[PDB]
């Protein structure tokens, strides 16, 4: 099952599903809230080498998108520009609506070679690529994106 | 909810799209209005009785699901995430006979 | 709960040395980044140096008219940390102020960058030179 | 490296007003700034860590804000005790020489 936050007395904790908690008061869709945290907030190398060495290529998986409405505002973003030496692409272009993300004080604009042995990439330890608005499990070409997960979130109101 | 992450950001500065209300003139219209990159409102959230930190450890607890939720459906893009978690809470407590005095049954 | 202990200072005379000792207690001394600073009587705060722990590699740091006359060390065994200082020059004239980097601390720190967040003070010391 | 300039650099209120003191950054920094209380003849005291986040201790009226260059610090009501000069240091990098503001003292009125 998928885990969702009580923030009740300005007090956090995952919402039992077993239990069932009478005086929790959802009103309104709009107290329903999806929230992008950026794995810059967990402390995770940022440079260049660790980053790029965090994703890899694979075939076989069908990509998967899903919305949310808030996020964070990243210190370091990236945009790949990756070809195979042949000069074909090895990432796709952004489908229609997915832009870049939209607050990064630095953009890591990575060009260059690679086998690319795959034909998606993925992030190896499962987090998601955040871009305006919307979390994928692949990369985007040349689309700016953070490095990021989602929680679900009751706003009490 | 224990942070178990190496290191956490303390202070959360958040962005929406939704309004903040007080809409200006005429500014709602598209012609007028602004462009993609400025449609954002901001917000700085500050670590509360170890809020912040905790936030983040439930993405990273819900990351898992998440993922297999992903695979299971067959959209290419997901937005009734939202709407379902809603749905399953009304029929939490309302799905069945509403039986007073029941532990799943919230009457007054 | 935590507290530091500040001891060594007095006057000496300008080109002379001195020793300063820092004593810690109430928290993880081997984990936590040690630091000096100075308030000069009329301009205020000036950070003087910078010893990391033992785990990131104990690497220290000195100030811009610090470098070259002053000496940083520590022992884990008896929680202190000294201060040692050679070519004393009179704008050295300063109340020292010995302060630790908490290992609490150190999670909060998320870009990963170097500086650090001063978490408590000692009493501090007098040191004064004059001819 | 660094420059960090405060102001103002005294100040004089009553007791219950609204206090608010600015911190401004030479380079960029993302919320690396901390807020020391200084009373007299006794050490510094961390009131702020980073932005906004209050030290376990520190009375609710202390509050933080800002990111980037600019940084505010904000008493909602000034009581007796609080009578001490306030500094505002960087920790973005390896601190320089002017990492330490100059001090705004606060002074009550009556």
């Known amino acids: 099952s998928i885990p969702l936050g009580v923030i009740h007395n300005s007090t956090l904790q995952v919402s039992d599903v077993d239990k069932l908690v009478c005086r929790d008061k959802l009103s309104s869709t709009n107290q329903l809230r999806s929230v992008g945290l950026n794995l810059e907030g967990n402390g995770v190398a940022t440079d260049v080498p660790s980053a790029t060495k965090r994703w890899g290529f694979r075939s076989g998986v069908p990509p998967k998108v899903v919305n949310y409405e808030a996020g964070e505002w990243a210190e370091n973003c990236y945009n790949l520009e990756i070809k195979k030496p042949d000069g074909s692409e090895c990432l796709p272009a952004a489908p229609d609506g997915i832009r870049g993300f939209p607050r990064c004080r630095y953009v890591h604009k990575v060009s260059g070679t690679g086998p690319c042995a795959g034909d998606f990439a993925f992030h190896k330890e499962g987090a998601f690529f955040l871009y305006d608005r919307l979390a994928s499990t692949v990369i985007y070409r040349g689309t700016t994106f953070a490095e990021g997960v989602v929680a679900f979130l009751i706003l009490p109101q | 909810i224990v942070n178990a992450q190496p290191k956490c950001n303390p202070n959360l500065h958040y962005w929406t799209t939704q309004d903040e209300g007080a809409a200006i003139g005429l500014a709602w219209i598209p012609y007028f209005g602004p462009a993609a990159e400025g449609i954002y409102i901001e917000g700085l959230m500050h670590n509360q009785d170890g809020l912040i930190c905790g936030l983040r450890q439930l993405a990273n607890e819900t990351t898992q699901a998440l993922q297999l939720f992903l695979r299971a459906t067959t959209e290419l893009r997901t937005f009734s995430i939202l709407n379902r978690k809603a749905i399953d809470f009304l029929l939490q407590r309302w799905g069945g006979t509403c039986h007073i005095l029941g532990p799943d049954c919230c009457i007054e | 709960e935590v507290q530091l202990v500040e001891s060594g200072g007095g006057l000496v005379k300008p080109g002379g040395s001195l020793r300063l000792s820092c004593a810690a207690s109430g928290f993880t001394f081997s984990n936590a980044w040690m630091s000096w600073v100075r308030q000069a009587p009329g301009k205020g705060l000036e950070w003087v140096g910078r010893?990391?722990?033992?785990?990131?590699?104990?690497?220290?740091d000195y100030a811009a008219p610090v470098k070259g006359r002053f000496t940083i060390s520590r022992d884990d065994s008896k929680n202190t940390v000294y201060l040692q200082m050679t070519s004393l020059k009179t704008e050295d004239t300063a109340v020292y102020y010995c302060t630790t980097y908490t290992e609490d601390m150190r999670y909060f720190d998320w870009l990963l960058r170097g500086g650090e967040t001063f978490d408590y003070w000692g009493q501090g010391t007098l040191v004064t030179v004059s001819s | 490296d660094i420059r960090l300039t405060q102001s103002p650099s005294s100040l004089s209120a009553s007791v219950g007003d609204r206090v608010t003191i600015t911190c401004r950054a030479s380079?960029?920094?993302?919320?690396?700034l901390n807020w020391y209380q200084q009373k007299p003849g006794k050490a510094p005291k961390l009131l702020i860590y980073?932005?906004?986040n209050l030290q376990s201790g520190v009375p609710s009226r202390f509050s933080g804000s800002g990111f980037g260059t600019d940084f505010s610090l904000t008493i909602s009501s000034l009581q007796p005790e609080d009578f001490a000069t306030y500094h505002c240091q960087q920790s973005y990098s390896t601190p320089g020489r002017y990492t330490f503001g100059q001090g705004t003292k606060v002074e009550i009125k009556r």
């Open positions: 980073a932005a906004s």
């Open positions: 380079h960029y920094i993302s919320t690396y």
């Open positions: 010893i990391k722990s033992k785990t990131d590699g104990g690497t220290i």
